[PDB]
Design a protein around this ligand. Structure first.
Ligand SMILES: *C(=O)[C@@H](NC(=O)[C@H](N)c1ccccc1)[C@@H]1N[C@@H](C(=O)O)C(C)(C)S1
Length: 450
């Protein structure tokens, strides 16, 4: 129990298939799940979409092709594939050319109709939206909608710091950054900021102290449709395909044209494995809106995703999540709220159906992979290779949800929702001892005593 001052612990530990818990500490109390939400996303995804689902992107033609000229529109139909790469667009364009299209007497349509409404879930902090871990998981993703930039201080203080960016990234960078002399009075409270604008404009503002080396930065693309469009436009031009119209967005549901090129992701089981092992927000959130699209046959939205996951858990898994709030697939949202006792029902379902789902093998294994390769507390408890669990991690939050095989060989499911492991400013970069000692004793206890 003895953690630092002010932290909030809800904890439940329960033998697989048992009706009573071994440990029950505030298990009914709802908490922020953070990335442990991905356990629920993966279960709902496997039930709704199946392990063999693949994300799809196509180039389609609407119109007849006469002497190499398409009389009509080229449609690039995006499908929320989180693994789509620039190369993939290049290869699809190569295929289009090879099929005999040299020219489009028409428009080039960037079709995102698979999804609708905002590409950002309710409850996501605005300030993180330009960080790649929170890049809007839109229908149109290329290279994870994340790009990098180099910021160089100016040789002469007072002059503008300047930005280098690879020419192939269709973004527009502006610097309003003032370079500060060493010892400037401004260093303390002058911030270095990124301000996103329309059409993938970014302005860097504020101050940068002199440095000998450039500062590397990575940012999230805010308008994936425009970004993918510019990549497509560039690849069309390089392949020698001309067009008379313009690049337009297509957002309304429409009958497919003739598929001339396509790309499918790896199978969903493989993607869910990456997601659980590495805690991939983008895979979780593209999956989440896909679940709603599939279940209700409507463009995927956050609301449809939430409704669908609740229905799938109740109807296929027998889990009534009650007053649980599910806002997204990744757990980014500060709106997500769930009790250890509700997550426990999910974990029990997974364990009972694990031979069907092949689910537990996707979770990080303590001491081997993903997020638990070295978790000090688990290592020190002597439980490496005995815990398969999903982390939920952000400032002051140390959640864990999954399974442990005990000294007697009994498998137990557990949920540790721990937050407010906040520290005073003067110790903010050190916060470890109590957690590690707590986890070491706890999982040692659970392991040895069960
Ligand atoms: C799940 O809890 C996710 N956490 C976040 O997105 C946090 N906003 C965050 C924490 C630290 C750094 C950047 C973002 C995922 N789990 C994290 C983890 O496993 O450490 C993550 C960084 C891979 S994102």
């Amino acid at each position: 129990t003895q953690l630092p001052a002010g932290a909030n612990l809800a904890l439940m530990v329960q033998k697989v298939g048992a009706s009573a818990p071994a440990i029950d500490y505030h298990s009914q109390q709802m908490a922020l799940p953070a990335s442990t939400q991905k356990v629920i996303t993966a279960l709902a995804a496997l039930i709704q979409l199946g392990p063999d689902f693949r994300f799809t992107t196509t180039l389609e033609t609407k119109g007849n092709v006469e002497n190499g000229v398409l009389k009509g529109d080229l449609v690039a139909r995006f499908g929320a594939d989180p693994t789509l790469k620039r190369q993939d667009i290049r290869n699809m364009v190569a295929t289009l050319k090879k099929s005999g299209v040299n020219q489009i007497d028409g428009n080039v349509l960037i079709d995102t109709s698979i999804f609708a409404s905002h590409d950002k879930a309710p409850g996501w902090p605005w300030n993180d939206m330009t960080q790649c871990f929170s890049a809007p998981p839109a229908a149109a993703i290329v290279d994870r909608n994340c790009f990098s930039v180099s910021l160089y201080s100016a040789p002469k203080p007072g002059d503008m710091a300047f930005i280098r960016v690879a020419s192939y990234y269709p973004v527009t960078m502006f610097s309003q950054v003032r370079t500060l002399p060493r010892g400037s009075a401004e260093a303390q409270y002058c911030e270095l900021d990124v301000v996103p604008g329309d059409l993938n404009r970014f302005t860097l503002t504020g101050c940068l102290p002199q440095r000998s080396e450039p500062l590397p930065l990575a940012f999230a693309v805010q308008d994936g449709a425009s970004y993918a469009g510019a990549i497509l436009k560039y690849e069309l031009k390089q392949a020698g395909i001309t067009w008379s119209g313009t690049l337009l967005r297509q957002t309304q549901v429409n009958e497919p044209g003739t598929v001339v090129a396509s790309k499918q992701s790896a199978p969903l089981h493989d993607l869910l494995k990456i997601m659980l092992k590495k805690s991939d927000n983008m895979i979780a959130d593209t999956v989440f809106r896909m679940i709603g699209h599939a279940r209700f046959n409507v463009p995927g939205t956050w609301r449809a995703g939430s409704d669908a996951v609740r229905q799938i858990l109740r109807q296929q898994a027998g889990v009534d999540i009650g007053n649980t709030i599910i806002a997204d697939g990744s757990g980014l949202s500060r709106h997500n709220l769930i009790a250890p006792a509700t997550m426990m029902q999910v974990l029990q379902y997974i364990a009972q159906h694990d031979n069907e789902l092949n689910f537990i093998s996707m979770l990080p294994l303590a001491g081997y992979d993903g997020s638990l390769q070295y978790r000090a507390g688990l290592h020190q408890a002597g439980v490496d290779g005995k815990v398969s669990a999903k982390t939920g991690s952000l400032q002051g939050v140390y959640n864990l949800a999954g399974f442990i095989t005990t000294a007697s060989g009994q498998r137990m499911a557990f949920v540790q929702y721990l937050s407010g492991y906040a520290v005073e400013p003067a110790d903010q970069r050190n916060r470890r001892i109590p957690l590690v000692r707590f986890e070491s004793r706890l999982y040692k206890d659970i392991y040895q005593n069960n």
